Symmetry: C3
Subunit: 404 residues, 3 copies
Amino acid sequence: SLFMSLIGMAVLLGIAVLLSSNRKAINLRTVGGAFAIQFSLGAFILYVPWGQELLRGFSDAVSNVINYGNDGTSFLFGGLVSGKMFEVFGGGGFIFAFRVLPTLIFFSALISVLYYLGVMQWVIRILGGGLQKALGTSRAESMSAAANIFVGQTEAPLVVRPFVPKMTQSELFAVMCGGLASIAGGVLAGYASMGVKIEYLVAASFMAAPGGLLFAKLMMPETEKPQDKPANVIDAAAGGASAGLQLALNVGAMLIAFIGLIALINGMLGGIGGWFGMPELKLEMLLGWLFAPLAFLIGVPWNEATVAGEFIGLKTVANEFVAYSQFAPYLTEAAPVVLSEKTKAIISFALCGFANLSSIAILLGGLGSLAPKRRGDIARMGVKAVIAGTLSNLMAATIAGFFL
Amino acid sequence: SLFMSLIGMAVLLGIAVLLSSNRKAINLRTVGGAFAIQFSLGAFILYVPWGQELLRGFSDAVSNVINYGNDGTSFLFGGLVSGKMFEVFGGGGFIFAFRVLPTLIFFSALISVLYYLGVMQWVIRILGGGLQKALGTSRAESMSAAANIFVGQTEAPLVVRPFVPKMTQSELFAVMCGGLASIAGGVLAGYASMGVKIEYLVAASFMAAPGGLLFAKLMMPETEKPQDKPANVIDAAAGGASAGLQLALNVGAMLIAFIGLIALINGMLGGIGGWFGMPELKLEMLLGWLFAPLAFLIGVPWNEATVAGEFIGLKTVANEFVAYSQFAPYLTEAAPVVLSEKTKAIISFALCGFANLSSIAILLGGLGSLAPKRRGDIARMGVKAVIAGTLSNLMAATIAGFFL
Amino acid sequence: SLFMSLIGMAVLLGIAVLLSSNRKAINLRTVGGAFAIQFSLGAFILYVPWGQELLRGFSDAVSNVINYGNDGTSFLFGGLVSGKMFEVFGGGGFIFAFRVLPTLIFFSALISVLYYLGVMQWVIRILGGGLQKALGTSRAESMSAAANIFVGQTEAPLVVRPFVPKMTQSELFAVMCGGLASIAGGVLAGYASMGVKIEYLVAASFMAAPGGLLFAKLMMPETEKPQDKPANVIDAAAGGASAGLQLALNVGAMLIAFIGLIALINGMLGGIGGWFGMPELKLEMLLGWLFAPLAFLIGVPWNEATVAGEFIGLKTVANEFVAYSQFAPYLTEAAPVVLSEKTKAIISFALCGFANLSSIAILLGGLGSLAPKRRGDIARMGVKAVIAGTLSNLMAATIAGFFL
Ligand SMILES: CCCCCCCCCCO[C@@H]1O[C@H](CO)[C@@H](O[C@H]2O[C@@H](CO)[C@@H](O)[C@H](O)[C@@H]2O)[C@H](O)[C@H]1O
Ligand SMILES: CCCCCCCCCCO[C@@H]1O[C@H](CO)[C@@H](O[C@H]2O[C@@H](CO)[C@@H](O)[C@H](O)[C@@H]2O)[C@H](O)[C@H]1O
Ligand SMILES: CCCCCCCCCCO[C@@H]1O[C@H](CO)[C@@H](O[C@H]2O[C@@H](CO)[C@@H](O)[C@H](O)[C@@H]2O)[C@H](O)[C@H]1O
Ligand SMILES: O=c1ccn([C@@H]2O[C@H](CO)[C@@H](O)[C@H]2O)c(=O)[nH]1
Ligand SMILES: O=c1ccn([C@@H]2O[C@H](CO)[C@@H](O)[C@H]2O)c(=O)[nH]1
Ligand SMILES: O=c1ccn([C@@H]2O[C@H](CO)[C@@H](O)[C@H]2O)c(=O)[nH]1
Ligand code: NA
Ligand code: NA
Ligand code: NA
């Protein structure tokens, strides 16, 4: 029972220690506090009544902002996003391209507005400062960690851009890990519109901050000594719309391509499996088979660990967006398999991160532009950082499965 | 009656004089002629029979080019832009993304073709030359003013690009003002497809040329001494399609974002107004309340000035595209309020300009690239130029309301 | 009969000889072998049983990859690409924007994956080497010719990019000609989805390799002496999706614009023809009238040569994509004219090339970036190279019409 989870946590921490660049330099105050905050944050918002109330309050607000944003998409696509669509096409009346993608545009505009107004900086400063006084992490790395709660891996470091070129390897690694452990407001709204529970997405975003520092500081302890805008609000909103347009277009093409490539891989796997008596072989069977142990380890019941493995595996080998798109159907009454409410929570939490190999190329471009002489360092540390981020998502799922 | 309008005109001119950089350097020939042409142009095409006939003749031609362009969108979107759409979804069968936006693509291609063929240059040279001999404005600023009738603020100066780096501050200011006072062929076709009357759009585009010079030369009189391509027609058309694609994508994302942000602002305003006994508070009430005087001043009947204020206010604080999108419904039998045909004309004319604060950032990039050392000057003069452009749109609306 | 074709071939070769930069330097081994391979390849796959079987086998595979890729578009557009669309809108239920364009995205991703895995390089090396040992063409120009079977004119030279800056004028010209004579995997899948027969598209792509060298070496014989990557497979797929997105967007805007401009040209032609007693005058009549001789010359029956001319003419003056879009309707039971199965094959083959004037601007940018000092040479040789490519497509159509 609750024992299989506390071992899950122990195993995750252990792997990080085994992979550390220097176990003897690990600061127990830093890593102990970091775990304590991620664990307590979970308990607070997933277990204690007052916590559950703040979480549901924040989630309902987010759900309202989303609905407000949909007035814009309704203006652009009209009847193609109305109730009439379900009467005519049934299930296929939900057009993903017009229901989900335009949300990334509206959220980016909104986030850009909140930065111009100083609202983001205000929230980041309080959370980032809380982390550093509690953990002894540097100022710049703590701010980047907090910013990553709300924005993507290449956007979050912008709040400390002048300090990036000269941060320590341990600081730069943490900055990467905070990005890989979290997601971003725009896609969060996307996943929600796909049916993923907002409470889970919000909780996982907040837990990514200490989670990312926890595993960065286990795997890459500090061995050095750290140191230490649009003309108006309308231009801010337009610049945000433009960046989100570009994001929406990219995510759309990636989904058409990746989902297409998986179908082709499955056609090939069936013909190849056939030579070995397994004509039914598919990419989902390999991944389920291969990741079931890990799913079991974080608290998925033995009889659901294999289906859970498919989703977790897909997020790791491809990205969380392709994974969520294959997981969303299991969140509706038309699911091929009815999963426990606890297994749904665990999958939702473990998928909630940008941790995958392709995020390295993105960090090289985006985070690299802030410190062009540190691109060698980013490439070198890329794989470890993806592992760090993966461990953080897994730890959050274990904690969540525990308190549920 | 016709008295409330002639005072409207007087007030608009007066504000410009009050804001001038040097009232004593204002050239009466220049500003008197400029007003005389804008006023007479209106009379000619809105009042005198032969004028009304040329205008309706030009508008019908434009309406035919639009219909021709729709064959291309029909090929791409098929049934989604057919009559069957209205039978199935009713009013929401009109999909804005496929009905309006593709028109920007076709018009840009067409404009690019007419430049390659020398047809644009020919028309610009006649109108621009007529202006300068009549007003004593410089050659380059007069050409830019005429070009702005047909193309956007960043495209119009291209006909005089080699002379821009060295124009006088008064010349550069006029170039900006001609851009802010007008629109462009692509979006004109958009507004028409939305239901805005072509006659009004065309008339306002032509009146923007003297109107923009009028207010530039009132607010920034000349105190210095002024001076003085695609390989084939198919590449021209393709380069124009490509630029219009980019424009269509940007306008679409801006609409999803801005309309979304207004709905969120309204949710917030309702909760905030509620603390003061006004739970019904919205952004449209603030703007209507705030701009009613101005609407009244240009000839909107007292009892329609508040609804007129909403649209005029929205165009000023955001842009004309968001404004037209909220005004278009009042042009159909399904309008929340039936407005006089005179109030519809006045709103249509006063919305017909790129004059807003966000157009400054666009001028900095586009007009700045032609004269990188004059970017400081553009930023400095930005706000005055937006005011100049606003006065020009307002003056055109007053003149139009008068002759109707 | 079969005589009218062998004269077609003779005429095509003759024009090339007449236009040569030096008929006395033409290498008979090179040009004789090149023609022998194009002709024999046709015979092999269009006539001999075993050949027809390999071709239909390769075409069916391609047809399966396409269907696999459509799972991705189905996820993004849902009901708008389902069988229900035809019940509601009938013929107009086929939305080109969602049926055809997303295929360019999936194919680009796939091609990018096959390069990362070394599968493309492997196939190119065998075919390119076969060509050079047989023809005595240089190594680099032979590889570029083979690569052009599968990828576009600006992508194919990438397999020999370090050698491009220093190739001979005859080599550079051949590189251009291989691009103009062929198409690319992405658009091939597009044309197929439009109804064009895959067997024809595949056969024409393979015949473009010797065909392009044949006419390059007739028109620009060698008079000089020739000489002689994404971090992982997921980044490869994403980079390919992104490039194909950009391509899909461009092709879409070009189609809206060009088809729109043709409708406007037709409105104007009707009014102008009217002054000469031909109110029915259209762009298709001019092109059919003007290209009928050429269509007749390649084996189109006298009574179908005029309709065939429309399509061939349109591909030459605009591009093959606009042409295929006007030709596709004649491939369905709802065709305005029922054409012989032989006339359909001939049109399909003669349209199958990037040979048009606009492809020069594209070669300047793409091929020019590989050798910035050779841009002058590319511009100078552009028109001859388009003629060379056109002759290659025409020759392939004649050969095909012969063996059918
Ligand atoms: C959708 C279903 C199909 C899923 C199956 C796909 C599995 C592919 C695994 C990725 O392969 C590796 O990825 C690394 C990450 O990019 C590369 O690191 C190389 O590149 C840099 C990446 O960080 C360096 O950090 C590394 O040290 C190293 O040099 C490495 O070469 C590459 O072989
Ligand atoms: C959709 C409904 C909501 C509507 C409400 C929004 C109202 C916002 C008003 C804009 O605020 C100002 O805009 C100026 C224009 O950009 C800025 O000028 C600054 O920036 C340059 C702009 O030109 C300079 O010209 C100026 O002198 C100045 O420095 C200025 O700082 C900024 O405060
Ligand atoms: C859709 C229905 C309508 C169809 C009718 C359109 C017909 C237009 C024909 C194109 O005109 C020529 O195209 C050349 C190719 O671009 C140009 O070459 C010029 O530009 C370079 C192109 O290669 C050089 O190679 C040339 O030598 C030359 O200087 C040339 O100037 C231009 O006049
Ligand atoms: O704001 C965002 C959204 C997405 N992604 C990338 O796109 C993938 C799919 O969401 C993620 O894993 C991440 O690599 C970002 O980098 N930033
Ligand atoms: O050709 C165009 C079309 C639009 N816009 C910008 O987009 C806004 C919305 O139409 C305008 O106010 C203007 O700022 C341009 O600058 N040029
Ligand atoms: O991969 C591609 C696809 C299209 N095109 C260009 O786009 C036109 C339309 O397909 C072609 O003739 C060619 O000029 C390319 O250059 N490369
Ligand atoms: Na983040
Ligand atoms: Na203009
Ligand atoms: Na090719």
